[PDB]
Amino acid sequence: LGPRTEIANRFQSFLRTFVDERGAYTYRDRIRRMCEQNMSSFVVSYTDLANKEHVLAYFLPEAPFQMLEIFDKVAKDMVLSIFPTYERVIHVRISPLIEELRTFRKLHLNQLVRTLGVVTATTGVLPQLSVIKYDCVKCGYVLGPFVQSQNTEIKPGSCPECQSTGPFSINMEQTLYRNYQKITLQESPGRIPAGRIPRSKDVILLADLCDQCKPGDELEVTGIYTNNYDGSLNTDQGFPVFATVIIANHVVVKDSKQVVQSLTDEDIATIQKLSKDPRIVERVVASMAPSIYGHDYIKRALALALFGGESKNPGEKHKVRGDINLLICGDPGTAKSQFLKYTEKVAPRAVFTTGQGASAVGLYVRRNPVSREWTLEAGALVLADQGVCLIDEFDKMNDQDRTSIHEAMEQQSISISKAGIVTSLQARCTVIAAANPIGGRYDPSMTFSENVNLSEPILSRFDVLCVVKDEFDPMQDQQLAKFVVHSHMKHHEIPQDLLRQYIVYAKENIRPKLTNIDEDKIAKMYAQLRQESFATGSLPITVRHIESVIRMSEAHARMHLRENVMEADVSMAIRMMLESFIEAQKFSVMKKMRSTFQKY
Amino acid sequence: VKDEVGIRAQKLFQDFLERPAASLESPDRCTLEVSFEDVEKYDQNLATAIIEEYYHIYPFLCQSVSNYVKDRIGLKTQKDCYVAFTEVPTRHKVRDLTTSKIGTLIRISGQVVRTHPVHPEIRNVEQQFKFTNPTICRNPVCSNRKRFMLDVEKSLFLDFQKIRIQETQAELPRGCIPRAVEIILRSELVETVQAGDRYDFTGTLIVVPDVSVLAGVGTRAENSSRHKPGMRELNYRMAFLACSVQATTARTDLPMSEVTAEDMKKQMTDAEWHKIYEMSKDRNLYQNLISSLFPSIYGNDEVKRGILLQQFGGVAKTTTEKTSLRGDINVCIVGDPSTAKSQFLKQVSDFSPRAIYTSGKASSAAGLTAAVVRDEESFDFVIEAGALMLADNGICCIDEFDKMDQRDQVAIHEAMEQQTISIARAGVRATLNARTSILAAANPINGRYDRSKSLQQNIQLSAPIMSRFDLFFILVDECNEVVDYAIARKIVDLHSNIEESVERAYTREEVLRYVTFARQFKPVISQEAGHMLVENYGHLRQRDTGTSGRSTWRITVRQLESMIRLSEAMAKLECSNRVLERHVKEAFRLLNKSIIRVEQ
DNA sequence: ATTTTTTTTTTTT
Numbered sequence A: 001l002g003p004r005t006e007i008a009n010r011f012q013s014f015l016r017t018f019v020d021e022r023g024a025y026t027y028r029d030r031i032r033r034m035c036e037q038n039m040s041s042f043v044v045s046y047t048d049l050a051n052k053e054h055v056l057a058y059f060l061p062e063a064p065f066q067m068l069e070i071f072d073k074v075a076k077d078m079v080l081s082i083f084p085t086y087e088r089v090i091h092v093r094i095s096p097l098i099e100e101l102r103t104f105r106k107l108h109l110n111q112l113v114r115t116l117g118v119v120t121a122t123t124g125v126l127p128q129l130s131v132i133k134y135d136c137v138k139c140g141y142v143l144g145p146f147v148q149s150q151n152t153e154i155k156p157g158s159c160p161e162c163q164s165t166g167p168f169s170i171n172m173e174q175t176l177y178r179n180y181q182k183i184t185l186q187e188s189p190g191r192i193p194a195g196r197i198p199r200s201k202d203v204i205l206l207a208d209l210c211d212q213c214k215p216g217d218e219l220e221v222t223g224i225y226t227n228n229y230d231g232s233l234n235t236d237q238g239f240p241v242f243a244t245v246i247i248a249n250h251v252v253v254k255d256s257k258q259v260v261q262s263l264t265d266e267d268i269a270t271i272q273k274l275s276k277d278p279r280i281v282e283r284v285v286a287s288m289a290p291s292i293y294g295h296d297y298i299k300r301a302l303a304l305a306l307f308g309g310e311s312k313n314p315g316e317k318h319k320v321r322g323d324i325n326l327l328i329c330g331d332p333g334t335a336k337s338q339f340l341k342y343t344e345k346v347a348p349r350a351v352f353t354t355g356q357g358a359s360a361v362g363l364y365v366r367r368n369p370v371s372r373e374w375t376l377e378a379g380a381l382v383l384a385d386q387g388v389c390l391i392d393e394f395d396k397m398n399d400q401d402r403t404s405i406h407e408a409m410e411q412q413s414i415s416i417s418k419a420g421i422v423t424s425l426q427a428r429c430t431v432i433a434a435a436n437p438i439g440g441r442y443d444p445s446m447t448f449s450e451n452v453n454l455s456e457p458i459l460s461r462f463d464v465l466c467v468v469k470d471e472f473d474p475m476q477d478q479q480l481a482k483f484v485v486h487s488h489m490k491h492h493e494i495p496q497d498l499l500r501q502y503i504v505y506a507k508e509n510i511r512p513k514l515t516n517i518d519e520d521k522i523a524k525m526y527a528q529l530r531q532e533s534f535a536t537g538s539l540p541i542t543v544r545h546i547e548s549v550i551r552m553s554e555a556h557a558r559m560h561l562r563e564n565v566m567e568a569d570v571s572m573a574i575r576m577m578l579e580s581f582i583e584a585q586k587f588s589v590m591k592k593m594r595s596t597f598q599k600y
Numbered sequence B: 001v002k003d004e005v006g007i008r009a010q011k012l013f014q015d016f017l018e019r020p021a022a023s024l025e026s027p028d029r030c031t032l033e034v035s036f037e038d039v040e041k042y043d044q045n046l047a048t049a050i051i052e053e054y055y056h057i058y059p060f061l062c063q064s065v066s067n068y069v070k071d072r073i074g075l076k077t078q079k080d081c082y083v084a085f086t087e088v089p090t091r092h093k094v095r096d097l098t099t100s101k102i103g104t105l106i107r108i109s110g111q112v113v114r115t116h117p118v119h120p121e122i123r124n125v126e127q128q129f130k131f132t133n134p135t136i137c138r139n140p141v142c143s144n145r146k147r148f149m150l151d152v153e154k155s156l157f158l159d160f161q162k163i164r165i166q167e168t169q170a171e172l173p174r175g176c177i178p179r180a181v182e183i184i185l186r187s188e189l190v191e192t193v194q195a196g197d198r199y200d201f202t203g204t205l206i207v208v209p210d211v212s213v214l215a216g217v218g219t220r221a222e223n224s225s226r227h228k229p230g231m232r233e234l235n236y237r238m239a240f241l242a243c244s245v246q247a248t249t250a251r252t253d254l255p256m257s258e259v260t261a262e263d264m265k266k267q268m269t270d271a272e273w274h275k276i277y278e279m280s281k282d283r284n285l286y287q288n289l290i291s292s293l294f295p296s297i298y299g300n301d302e303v304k305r306g307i308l309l310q311q312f313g314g315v316a317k318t319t320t321e322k323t324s325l326r327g328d329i330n331v332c333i334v335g336d337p338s339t340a341k342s343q344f345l346k347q348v349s350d351f352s353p354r355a356i357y358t359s360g361k362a363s364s365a366a367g368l369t370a371a372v373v374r375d376e377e378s379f380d381f382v383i384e385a386g387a388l389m390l391a392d393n394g395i396c397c398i399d400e401f402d403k404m405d406q407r408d409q410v411a412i413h414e415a416m417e418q419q420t421i422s423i424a425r426a427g428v429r430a431t432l433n434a435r436t437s438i439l440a441a442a443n444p445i446n447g448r449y450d451r452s453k454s455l456q457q458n459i460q461l462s463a464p465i466m467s468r469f470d471l472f473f474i475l476v477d478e479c480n481e482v483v484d485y486a487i488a489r490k491i492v493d494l495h496s497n498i499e500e501s502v503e504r505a506y507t508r509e510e511v512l513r514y515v516t517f518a519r520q521f522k523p524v525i526s527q528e529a530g531h532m533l534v535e536n537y538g539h540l541r542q543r544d545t546g547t548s549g550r551s552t553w554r555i556t557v558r559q560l561e562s563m564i565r566l567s568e569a570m571a572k573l574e575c576s577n578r579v580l581e582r583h584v585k586e587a588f589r590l591l592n593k594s595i596i597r598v599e600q
Numbered sequence C: 001a002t003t004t005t006t007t008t009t010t011t012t013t
């Protein structure tokens, strides 16, 4: 072509001469950074491209493919002219103006494009080709066409192996590959235009852009719109069988569950100088859920379920446990509606599911090839590495769904038996549920396992609780109609975007371990209660009555970064247990009051 | 050329008809709507000279349309066409259908269900279903099977969708059922629809250009030359097609029945103050709204006066973002047999639109989000079909709320409190927004309320049923000659057809017009008397405190929000913002009447 | 004909 005369010159005029930000533009050093990183993914921003030459926007999308090749060749001609040294061992990137799902259209094919999506379940990784070698049947001399050739034929009887070989042979060797894995698309439930058709489309990536995706997770892409190579061409039915394919140039994160702040750095000190002491059971707690009045119990409650998961392997036994577990029995009429929102934004891992009617039966392993229509789906347990399953109306789920969950709490894992493949799934996760009772809406101080009927081997694995019987208290209700109006009159501590720094650091640094500090007290909570709290509602003491306490009293102190412990914050957490445990037993209940008000 | 008959058609068309077109110019969408009466105003009644050659000659009307566009816009070969004819008199029925009705421009309607999504589809015309990519030659002699593949990049395309539609309900014959019929439509009509509308489409039926056939054992043949010195078959089936839409019946600038053209905030959104405000505050209007709407109906006459705000809007205030508020409310009716639960229940269906009459005892749980799909019908997963939420702010009242199974539980507790939608398949985890309320069609065990057991045990069903449903308003039978003879002497003229009901003085139509004017206020409530509704509810609570030894109830704050929605929509019924304290007295009065239905 | 699924009936203490 002619105009490419100018382009290469114009590229080389900026990749090592055009500079912003007070010299030494990165591109002069980016090349060598990636070179010493063995990485090969030079990146650009269209902003700086536009700062150089805004003519770089409209001779481009007559064919955006030529822009990238013309850039790749400047790369090669810059790499080895300067670094012929490492020439015995490219593609580029761009990453800035958004377009939307279902706005790419008939007209947005094969041009400058910038586009978004979300991940789900898809296939594995595989290789592709670039190069034409086939010949050797008559003479089969070395001929060597001069390109790696994508979809190219000549097929003569004359070709330089004594210009022969009209018949044909094939090679299985000296053959370039390039790995590749397929996607599945999804679209966000935040940016909903009210229940329109659910997004899933053919979209593509490549060798280097590979082995990074994860289900129900998101990544912003540059992307450019094309179609399948041949969508069902024959004189045929009353429609063509057409789909359309997108392909990835640069993949740019939408989630960032890790560190999120790139080049906030000004407010970061307020976390560890205000969420570090034992007063933070009031500072970090005043902002615990300041939405509506009732039940400050749950504010203290839910604050510490969010917090942990750990190895700390005891002596040579096994892995013991690293999970959280909550459940409540309420009544719609309770203010229990918002059951999963905010600290799952705090959560680096989690995935939602409302109740039966829409509860997961996936919660089934084969292995296939891919012809048309080959897929399988099941449980999210790899996902939720210290994440949570966010649910209401749990009591209806399937016993065998509970099997995995009991095993997750028991051996930190699930155990398939008698299948084709016997692959596994490790359980480092957390759970939330919101069921309803039997026989009504709540049964009193009478027993709790039958206040709402779960089964024997299942609930023993569960940890947290909060329960609401609720009689009247008037001043707060008048306050609440005042709250009705003034909250419907929005006529129109720890910083809010940094509290997550606490899940980063608090659980991270201080992970105390201890001898028996006074824990023969728990020998009493064993034995005395085996003789004191005897027959009212009074079985429930186990190793998990304290192992759960390791789970969460430690969280309560880990809030503080103590690193060494006496009984103080431990039993302040057991002040939840003086409050949580009391709830399950007959109105001859104050055996706990007597037996713990010193532990209060 | 015969189709110069169509040349004359568009010659005719253009000359004398020479701004929405100027609106089309940016993406060149090409769609313009024209009346079909134009064929009578100007084509001199060429309706039968025009109608039949629709897809015969529409190509040529298209051409002329583009040629019109050239007459002022610098036009290029890129231009394409749609045409959107309209105003079709003598609308035909679904049975108006044969071979013989090819190429017509018939008008029809229905609903929108069970739909499919966007999946789109030599400057010659190779776009056919009767198509072949491999062709013979252009200038020289080349092969007859070989092919190139070429510029799908500097060229002209379309976009479309697909649906199914069932037969209309103003047309409903004996025996036969609303069968399904299938269409693709062009782009500027795409995704501008939703379930539940009424139409006057273009019904231009065309055939399948099949690829293969099953049970198509009519002539099996081919256009094969004769003999002298696998094959294909042919059996098709029908479809339909379209070009133009008008969603009807669901309008406020419309001046309705009782109007004259006057001024307002909009044209005639509420322009008719001068006539309607006679019926605004003069509580004889209330008596009319008790009496001049159900002249054919007689029982308890509170239901005739408590229901009415149900049709009309609630709160929708300027409020928080954390949770939803509701305007409309849960509803029921009960009584005993032969107390005439069929008088009004159809006119529930009739009095306002989106007023869906359908039975409940037949339903499944798949009367919300149908079920799912697991073949590549559209994208292997289209699970946003439903049964309930089709109401775009409308009512879906159901019959026989008794023999139904225990699934509606999780449907409806969330429906009128949480307004969310999901299923437990391999679709996604997404949810959407309930628009609707309901009333009941309950009945007692044998009907007879023998006052010896609790209402909850006189029905003996699920628990929260009678806490969420805030108002029941039962109609119960006794043996008193006076009350039956009011009825019978209404039968005296319900068949003596002259004025054969109670004297009406306030038409349904003027009433249904004033309905929308009620919705244009946003009353805002900090009233002192409203603030003392806390005192009202406390004084209530002494009465909820009553009936608490014998027959205690399950009372909650839903009832509170109901009370305030009641007074709110009443001030909207007052044609006044700044809610009235009289609403306090009325609310307290009737709702402490609600307890009378449950005394034992 | 099999693979990946879903309900609507078939018949109930």
Ligand SMILES: Nc1ncnc2c1ncn2[C@@H]1O[C@H](COP(=O)(O)OP(=O)(O)OP(=O)(O)O)[C@@H](O)[C@H]1O
Pocket: A292, A293, A294, A331, A332, A333, A334, A335, A336, A337, A338, A392, A434, A480, B413, B414, B417, B418, B556, B557, B558
């Ligand atoms: N102590 C309280 N504080 C604030 N609001 C309350 C309180 N008690 C009751 N309410 C009100 O009572 C209503 C109860 O119904 P709600 O919408 O909470 O059902 P639900 O709890 O969401 O049902 P489920 O949790 O099973 O989905 C709430 O809207 C809430 O406003």
Ligand SMILES: Nc1ncnc2c1ncn2[C@@H]1O[C@H](COP(=O)(O)OP(=O)(O)OP(=O)(O)O)[C@@H](O)[C@H]1O
Pocket: B296, B297, B298, B299, B300, B336, B337, B338, B339, B340, B341, B342, B343, B487
């Ligand atoms: N107060 C009344 N006003 C008007 N009509 C009445 C009244 N009382 C009784 N009727 C008449 O009695 C008839 C009752 O039978 P209808 O077809 O409504 O039964 P239904 O209510 O569906 O019965 P069920 O509810 O037990 O199935 C009605 O047609 C109605 O005209």
